[PDB]
Design a protein around this nucleic acid. Structure first.
Lengths: 134, 184, 258, 171
RNA sequence: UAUCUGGUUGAUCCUGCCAGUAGUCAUAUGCUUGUCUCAAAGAUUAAGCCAUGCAUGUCUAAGUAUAAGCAAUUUAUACAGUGAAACUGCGAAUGGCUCAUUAAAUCAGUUAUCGUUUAUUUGAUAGUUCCUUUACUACAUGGUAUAACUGUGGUAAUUCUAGA
RNA sequence: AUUCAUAAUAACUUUUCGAAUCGCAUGGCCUUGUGCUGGCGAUGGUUCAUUCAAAUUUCUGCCCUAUCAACUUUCGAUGGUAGGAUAGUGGCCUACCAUGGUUUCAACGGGUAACGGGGAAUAAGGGUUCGAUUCCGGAGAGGGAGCCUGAGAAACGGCUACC
């Protein structure tokens, strides 16, 4: 919070996605790099558009420290960033908690198995059960 | 597949390996300039070959030919910018007479040596590699920089290095603990 | 290939799209549409690369899906609709209007035209025919078919459309001393002012054109798009007015007027 | 035995390999136009059958308790509007539409009818569709007659214009 | 970076090779587990053979769902939400891989089609259909084998199949 | 440049198409009936143009080999006429004369540790060698052959048969 001097460049008004598009470059002398929970709310107060309608990424540290450059963007509202922001960024920032899901290997194998089955499959379990006795 | 990433060589090995006159000169060159390899000379002579080839083809064309009027001027501006040839010429003369000594004279290894912050080409090379140098605002550790003549007044020690405050260095930090440990 | 190709590799997309080599291995194949494959600009590469309104093709699809962009007045809710030369496209957000035009160096420049300018488009008549029931029609360069054209208009003329209907509001003939645009060849994007047309009975009529700087050049007839008479072009010209500055004087103009 | 089903028309008591298609029994094509060669048994019954399928079409004086005492209730009722109309057949103005077949099935403590979506039913929207398509047709044909008539007027002006120019020539 | 050098003779000048020399998005291999970026990679022999697992599926406001599927009726007693299947439609002729064949044959410069087009896209375009015919008269709108689904099935077995 | 486009006239067509389809919207003059009209659209099956394609030619150009000089032999083998087939041209195939066609300017045979090209390596200048392989075109799906569906395949993570 000391001499972070965060600022934005190349601000262009993109209303089709209803956002402000720009690159963000920070000077952080005597600092490793600024994080999301710092840069996101700092970008929010400088812009006064919303709080969770801010997104930052990129953020390569300059060779030898000192400053960092990346990309940023601000929405008109949080209810408008929900309709546009990519899912992985929403989950990363805490705007969504993704439920655990089956792996690609397992998901594709299950699709292979149920493609082997014609119909819904309720009647198949009965015939196998009825024919399991002998 | 994704489009191939182009690459090109930067050095060229001499046709005859065991040349006493050439071997002595190259190792003589490395000492005077603190270079680690003969490849560091091979590339400069390879870079010079592309330049003499460029000017030779251009100079075969006639005067007031648009090709050399554009390409010759561009080569002049690039070479003047890097300081290899003298800036008080407007005659496309020095290019074909450029010697190997001119290119590695403009390298940052010797550039910071004669700017007084290094005191030796070998000390500079170690200084260069240990990141105690900023060309503009940015720390470099490239012994072969080709200063663009707008950075000789811009050279300075890296703010993220000793002699800059709030940064004594790891060996100094250990002696800082020794200062308190000595009494205790 | 047993059937039509549906992919387009990078290094095989047209060069004027200004695509890079890396960051992907497939270039956006323009779908079937009003303009040819090579001489068209997909909406994907325009909305993304030309303006940077979007960072990727997914987010252009988000732009597209809400019917904000519309070329010739029609929405075109698809990623690779081939908007081509002299096409008018509209971004109703803040009322931004675009005319797909050629720059000096042969690439699709980005315009900014007004609403009254974006109403009309110029179409070069590719052929003149009469269809069923003896009804005449003209095929424009973008594939439009206009029934009952003025009988005075022939092939290689230029009609202007209103883009709210399909009728021809005005037209300009092809003759010596008429302002023309070059669409194709190595002279792409140069504005011509026809001086002569030599025929070569049996194929590839040649036309000689000299721009405002008294530089003359020759191009095939199929590469010539008349855009007005002497003085006022029918459309707003791009920055540079298609004069083809040489590299030496383009170097100077870049240095002084940065 | 071994499960191979009999097929009508083969007219043999032995198993036969046949190239089967869509709309041919004993085979369901996974892919359009696909044909497969499969072994089938002939339609003639012999000792080799494992199971014979029989329908009873005329019951005798005797009865079998498992078949006659049980009558499987309705599972699906008619869906098409005219199909429902011939299922009851009372009248046309006797509002059978709101008396359509409803079946009582409850998943919990609440019950619902879940009537089928009646098809081919005359709706005000369907009257709207046919009305618009008739209007769009007449608007199309009328406009093409105006454009055709206007062009002939233009052609007449051009012919007179060309005639007027040659009037000046040759005295 | 328009170089050459060693080897026949007692010695010399040649012819002339052998050998050296430099490069190789040429390959292999020898000598190694401490660096940044970038990156080829079962082509050569075997277009040889393949265990296994993946690599083509597909839905909208808007073609079909009464899933006996999950769900606050008063906008859902005809259905109007979501929605597994199955039908229909589209796609699977793209992509990806490999280099066996192939010597005017492929291929390259893309001549011609006045020698043949219409997944598709885009634009345009069908007032002519009581064809047992100047209403002797359904378009406020003539049906059906069969899929799903319910039902004791057959076969060791397959993404096998009519039996209500 | 046409027997072109497109008319028009006998006719022929074994019904090709010429919307009984779907969503959202229910605005309005009325002697209250969907009765007068409704707006956006989705999917259309025909035709023309357009786009993405496909098929078809040689205009010129390919490595070594004469230890290959003649080759093309009912049954095609160059041309003609006609038909059939094809989406279409065409010996593409079927019904005849003439020996027609090619050839030392290298035909035709043979070899290729031969897919072609953009290119690569190597360079004073000319060259020599390579190019399975990131792009383009071709071909193939173990070897042959045949085919269904489909706008498009002689498809092989489609089918059929033999090896």
């Amino acid at each position: 919070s000391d001499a972070v001097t965060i600022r934005t460049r190349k601000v262009i008004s993109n209303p089709l996605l209803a956002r402000k598009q720009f690159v963000v470059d920070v000077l952080h002398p005597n600092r490793a790099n600024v994080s999301k929970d710092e840069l996101r709310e700092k970008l929010a107060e400088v812009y006064k558009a919303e709080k969770d309608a801010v997104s930052v990424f990129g953020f390569r540290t300059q060779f030898g420290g000192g400053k960092s450059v990346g990309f940023g963007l601000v929405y008109n509202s949080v209810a408008e960033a929900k309709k546009f922001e990519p899912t992985y960024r929403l989950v990363r920032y805490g705007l969504a908690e993704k439920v655990e899901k089956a792996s690609r290997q397992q998901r594709k194998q299950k699709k292979n198995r149920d493609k082997k089955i014609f119909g819904t499959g309720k009647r198949l379990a009965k015939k196998v059960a009825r024919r399991n006795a002998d | 597949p994704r489009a191939p990433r182009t690459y090109s060589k930067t050095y060229s090995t001499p046709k005859r390996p065991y040349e006493s006159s050439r071997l002595d000169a190259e190792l003589k060159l490395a000492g005077e300039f603190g270079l680690k390899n003969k490849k560091e000379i091979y590339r400069i002579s390879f870079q010079l070959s592309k330049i003499r080839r460029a000017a030779r083809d251009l100079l075969t064309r006639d005067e007031k030919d648009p090709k050399r009027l554009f390409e010759g001027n561009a080569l002049i501006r690039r070479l003047v910018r890097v300081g290899v040839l003298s800036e008080d010429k407007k005659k496309l003369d020095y290019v074909l007479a450029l010697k190997v000594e001119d290119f590695l004279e403009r390298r940052l290894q010797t550039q910071v040596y004669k700017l007084g912050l290094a005191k030796s080409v070998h000390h500079a090379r170690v200084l260069i590699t240990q990141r105690h140098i900023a060309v503009g605002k940015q720390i470099v550790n490239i012994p072969s920089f080709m200063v663009r003549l707008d950075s000789e007044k811009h050279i300075d020690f890296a703010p993220t290095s000793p002699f800059g405050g709030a940064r004594p260095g790891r060996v100094a930090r250990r002696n800082a603990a020794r200062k308190a440990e000595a009494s205790g | 290939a047993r059937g039509p190709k549906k992919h387009l590799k990078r290094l095989a997309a047209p060069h004027h799209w200004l695509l890079d080599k890396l960051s992907g291995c497939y270039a956006p194949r323009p779908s079937a549409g009003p303009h040819k494959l090579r001489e068209s600009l997909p909406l994907i590469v325009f909305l993304r690369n030309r303006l940077k309104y979007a960072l990727n093709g997914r987010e252009v699809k988000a732009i597209l899906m809400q019917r904000h962009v519309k070329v010739d007045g029609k929405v075109r809710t698809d990623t690779t609709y081939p908007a081509g030369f002299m096409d008018v496209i509209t971004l109703d957000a803040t009322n931004e209007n675009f005319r797909l035009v050629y720059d000096v160096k042969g690439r699709f420049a980005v315009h900014r035209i007004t609403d009254e300018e974006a109403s009309y488009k110029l179409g070069k008549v590719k052929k003149v025919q009469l269809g069923k029931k003896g009804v005449p029609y003209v095929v424009t360069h973008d594939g439009r078919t206009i029934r009952y054209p003025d009988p005075n208009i022939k092939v290689n003329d230029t009609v202007k459309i209103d883009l709210a209907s399909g009728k021809i509001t005005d037209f300009i003939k092809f003759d010596a001393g008429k302002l023309v645009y070059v669409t194709g060849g190595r002279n792409l994007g140069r504005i011509g002012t026809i001086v002569h047309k030599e025929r070569h009975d049996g194929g590839f009529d040649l036309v000689h054109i000299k721009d405002s700087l008294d530089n003359t050049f020759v191009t095939r007839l199929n590469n010539v798009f008349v855009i007005g008479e002497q003085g006022k072009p029918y459309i707003s010209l791009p920055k540079g007015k298609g004069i083809k500055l040489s590299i030496a004087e383009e170097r100077d103009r870049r240095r002084a007027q940065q | 035995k071994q499960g191979f089903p009999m097929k009508q028309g083969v007219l043999l008591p032995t198993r036969i390999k046949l190239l089967l298609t869509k709309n041919v029994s004993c085979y369901r094509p996974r892919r359009d136009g696909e044909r497969k060669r499969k072994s089938v048994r002939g339609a003639i019954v012999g000792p080799d059958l494992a199971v014979l399928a029989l329908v009873i079409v005329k019951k005798g004086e005797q009865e079998l308790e498992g078949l006659t005492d049980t009558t499987v209730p309705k599972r699906l009722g008619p869906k098409r509007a005219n199909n429902i109309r011939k299922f009851f057949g009372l009248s046309k103005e006797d509002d059978v539409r709101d008396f359509v077949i409803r079946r009582e099935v409850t998943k919990g403590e609440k019950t619902y009818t879940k009537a089928p979506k009646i098809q081919r039913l005359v709706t005000p929207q369907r009257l709207q569709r046919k009305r618009h398509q008739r209007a769009l047709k007449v608007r199309n044909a009328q406009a093409q007659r105006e454009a055709a008539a206007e062009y002939a007027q233009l052609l007449a002006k051009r012919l007179s214009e060309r005639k007027a120019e040659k009037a000046e020539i040759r005295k």
